[PDB]
């Protein structure tokens, strides 16, 4: 587990940081549960909002089947 955002002092998760966000989505493009990646709940919420923002801007896919 262990949370990579707590150990790095992240203020916000930055939807622009695609390289980081891609570690928190599956092959299908879905947000990985925080129980699998060990993210803290506060950072899991920030991360979901960032992923959805990036999906809106087409920096990330909603699905693997667009």
């Amino acid at each position: 587990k262990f949370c990579r955002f707590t150990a790095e002092g992240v203020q916000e998760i930055d939807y622009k940081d695609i390289a980081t966000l891609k570690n928190y989505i599956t092959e299908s493009g879905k947000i990985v549960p925080s129980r699998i990646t060990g993210t803290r709940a506060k950072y899991q919420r920030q991360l979901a909002r960032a992923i959805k923002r990036a999906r809106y801007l087409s920096l990330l896919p909603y699905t693997d089947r667009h």
């Binding site: 599956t26 092959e27 299908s28 879905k30 693997d64 089947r65």
Partner: protein, 70 residues
């Protein structure tokens, strides 16, 4: 789950990859759960029941830790 069969990878192995990809994505569970409408009261009840029974089974585990059967 989009599987592309790899060079020299046999058909059975690509099939197993496709199966694991489907299970990880949980497509079949999504289809099952979406076949009929589940009322919100029903869904909240079922979620609570799952949490309660998970907690109680761990209680059973941690407490059978002490008990000797013979």
């Amino acid at each position: 789950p989009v599987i592309k069969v790899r060079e020299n990878e046999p058909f059975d192995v690509a099939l197993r990859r496709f199966k694991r990809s489907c299970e990880k994505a949980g497509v079949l569970a999504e289809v099952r759960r979406r076949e009929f409408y589940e009322k919100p009261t029903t869904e909240r009840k079922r979620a609570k029941a799952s949490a309660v029974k998970r907690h109680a089974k761990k209680l059973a585990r941690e407490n059978a830790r002490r008990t000797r059967l013979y």
